[PDB]
Structure 1
Amino acid sequence: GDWSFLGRLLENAQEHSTVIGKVWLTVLFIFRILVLGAAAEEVWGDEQSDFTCNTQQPGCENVCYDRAFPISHVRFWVLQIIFVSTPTLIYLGHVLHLVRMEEKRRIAGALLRTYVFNIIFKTLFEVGFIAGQYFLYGFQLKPLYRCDRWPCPNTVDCFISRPTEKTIFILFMLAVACVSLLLNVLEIYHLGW
């Protein structure tokens, strides 16, 4: 996808942010957005095309792929990026609003509360997506999925495309997410002390 606009806004955000925040935005751009576009989207491109079920039943592969993958991992990661970035956009907008207010007439007062809330929201959204992915997929895609959804007769064996590569990238993104959490914790403590 085209992340250009979000890029513009977040680049603006870098200036009005802590050094650790600039590190966080670098991580977001490089290890999350760029990995997803350059590497992961191609991994998941044949997810349903090369999903195969051992059966002659029409409609079984469709319902089985749908039950195994209610949302694709890459779409989940898109949404995670958007939601962890939204607080930064809120804070940046409040900052620009105060600048416009000054013109009509760095981090302190209302902006400090807003920045702390921004880090907080980023952390909660962060953790939330991590836990949701754990409960939806664990952290390993196995090659076999056994499916008993109508119209499949009895239980059918279905086979995943590229499960090991997908597992590698699942874990890569989990690690990047954990690094982001650590960075946000560092921001909180660094402001505190």
Structure 2
Amino acid sequence: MDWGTLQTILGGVNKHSTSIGKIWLTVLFIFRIMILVVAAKEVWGDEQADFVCNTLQPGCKNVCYDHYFPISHIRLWALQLIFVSTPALLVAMHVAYRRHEEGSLWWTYTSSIFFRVIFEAAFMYVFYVMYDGFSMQRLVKCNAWPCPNTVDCFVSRPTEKTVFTVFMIAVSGICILLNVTELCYLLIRY
């Protein structure tokens, strides 16, 4: 995809936030989006076109690809970004509700931060359990029907996909830490 105007939306959402919340989470957020669109989205461009299986059985390539990649990484990251951005924007709408006509504003703001840490941890769990670590393999062995006994299939761009996987996981771990420290920073204020 592409974009036409993201500076206006970031400027408005910038206001009414804490020191680190104003900058650090925001710059890390646009950091992840930039990585996703300009670079990574076309590494996974031919994930199925260049999948190769050493067999003559028709339909074996379809099932073996689907058995090992139930959902591709880039569409896992796209889902994650949407989930961890909605609490940011709806609170911008809840205040717009009260504008048309302090505990409430405080209660909402502290609640959103509790959600963001939840979603990121949940999604990082899915990568680990689904893909068995963060390293992708050149060779996969598949024996689902209709494939005969056991078939060798070869992945496209295994090394580059590993690099971006490590990169997206790292900045997600940072965002979790930033949320936790900022959260406990408010708790002492009570």
User: What is the TM-score of this pair, normalised by structure 1?
Assistant: 0.89
- Structure 1 183/96 Cα, relative in aligned 2: closer, same or farther at 3 Å? same
* Counterpart Cα distance in 1 of 2:129 and 2:5: 32
Match of 1:167 among 155, 162, 166: 162
In the alignment, is residue 118 of structure 1 matched against residue 122 of structure 2?
no
Q: What's the CA shift for 1:100?
A: 2.3
Report the counterpart of residue 49 of structure 2 in structure 1.
Answer: 49
- Structure 1 8/132 Cα, relative in aligned 2: closer, same or farther at 3 Å? farther
1:24 partner amino acid: L
* Counterpart Cα distance in 2 of 1:34 and 1:159: 29
Report the counterpart of residue 75 of structure 2 in structure 1.
Answer: 75
User: What is the TM-score of this pair, normalised by structure 2?
Assistant: 0.91
Q: What's the CA shift for 1:82?
A: 0.1
Report the counterpart of residue 109 of structure 1 in structure 2.
Answer: 103
Question: SS of 2:26's equivalent?
Answer: helix
Post-superposition CA distance 1:90-145 (Å, at most 9, x none): 221112222223xxxxxx42111111110000010010000011111121111111
Report the counterpart of residue 149 of structure 1 in structure 2.
Answer: 144
Give the aligned length: 186
Question: SS of 1:150's equivalent?
Answer: coil
Consecutive unaligned residues of structure 2, counting only runs of 5 or more, are: none
Report the counterpart of residue 18 of structure 1 in structure 2.
Answer: 18
* Counterpart Cα distance in 1 of 2:128 and 2:78: 17
Post-superposition CA distance 1:63-90 (Å, at most 9, x none): 1111111111000000000001111122
Q: What's the CA shift for 1:26?
A: 1.4
Question: SS of 1:158's equivalent?
Answer: strand
Report the counterpart of residue 86 of structure 1 in structure 2.
Answer: 86
Consecutive unaligned residues of structure 1, counting only runs of 5 or more, are: 102-107
Greater RCO, CA 8 A, separation 6+: 1
Percent of residue pairs identical: 52
* Counterpart Cα distance in 1 of 2:122 and 2:104: 27
Across the aligned residues of Structure 1 and Structure 2, the Cα RMSD in angstroms comes to 1.8
